[PDB]
């Protein structure tokens, strides 16, 4: 039992090091994403041209379909309804 | 018969497309990798081309404003089948 | 992409000959399916 607990504690140390590696790298990726967003904002006329929490977990083709479906339902024809079914 | 049956209402909105064959050939290589289909189509759904054009995925055809047109073609197809 | 080109490659591959277009499509399919250590491109005018 002490052998099992020692080996499982070493496995938990390796898993905590992996979670920290994921987090560090993940944080760096998030920072890069923020910079990209800032660049997009800079690139961004706009003045003349001027549900979500469930759509946070959609697949990207499903997310594009959801955005286009809500845009077409609010834009031209109001006889359209969408719903997200799953777990 | 097969007018309003859910298997083949929307089979040929665009001319052809057969409702059966997979759009991308990478799926054909991935099927050949594990050794493996219209039963799966009737089980899970029909992979049409216009569905994936609405989804955003662009796949190459064999020979070298979509939303409003597809929904209007659905509106014409339902009225035609009821008529 | 630093933090697309496939559409430009499709607009270029519109003008390919049919055996070259079949080779392009099957090569992209085999590169995305199994072997990611593969790259294709179209050279010409």
């Amino acid at each position: 039992q002490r052998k099992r607990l020692a080996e499982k504690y070493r496995e938990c140390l390796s898993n905590k090091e992996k979670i920290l590696k994921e987090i560090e790298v993940k944080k760096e990726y998030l920072s890069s994403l923020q910079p990209r967003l800032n660049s997009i904002m800079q690139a961004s006329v706009q003045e003349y041209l001027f549900q979500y929490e469930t759509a946070r977990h959609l697949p990207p083709p499903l997310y594009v379909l959801f955005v286009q479906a809500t845009a077409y339902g609010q834009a031209c024809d109001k006889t359209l309804s969408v719903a997200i079914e799953g777990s | 018969g097969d007018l309003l049956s859910p298997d083949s209402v929307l089979s040929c909105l665009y001319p052809g497309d057969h409702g059966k064959k997979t759009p991308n050939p990478a799926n054909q290589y991935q099927f050949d990798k594990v050794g493996i289909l219209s039963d799966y189509v009737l089980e899970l759904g029909h992979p049409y081309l216009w569905v994936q054009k609405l989804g955003g995925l662009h796949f190459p055809k064999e020979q070298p404003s979509h939303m409003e047109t597809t929904m209007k073609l659905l509106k014409t197809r339902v009225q035609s089948r009821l008529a | 992409e630093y933090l697309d080109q496939a559409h430009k490659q499709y607009e270029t591959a519109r003008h390919l000959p049919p055996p070259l277009y079949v080779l392009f499509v099957q090569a992209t399919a085999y590169g995305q399916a199994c072997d990611k250590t593969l790259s294709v491109a179209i050279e010409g005018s």
């Binding site: 998030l30 990209r36 967003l37 997009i40 946070r56 997310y63 | 955003g56 662009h58 404003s65 979509h66 | -």
Partner: peptide, 28 residues
């Protein structure tokens, strides 16, 4: 998991922006 969900939301937003740019290029 929260960082992965935020990264997947940013990737889906970038894909939706690319799809909107493709729809604008197809319409024009």
């Amino acid at each position: 998991e929260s960082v992965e969900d935020k990264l997947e939301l940013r990737r889906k937003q970038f894909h939706v922006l690319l799809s909107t740019i493709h729809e604008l290029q197809q319409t024009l």
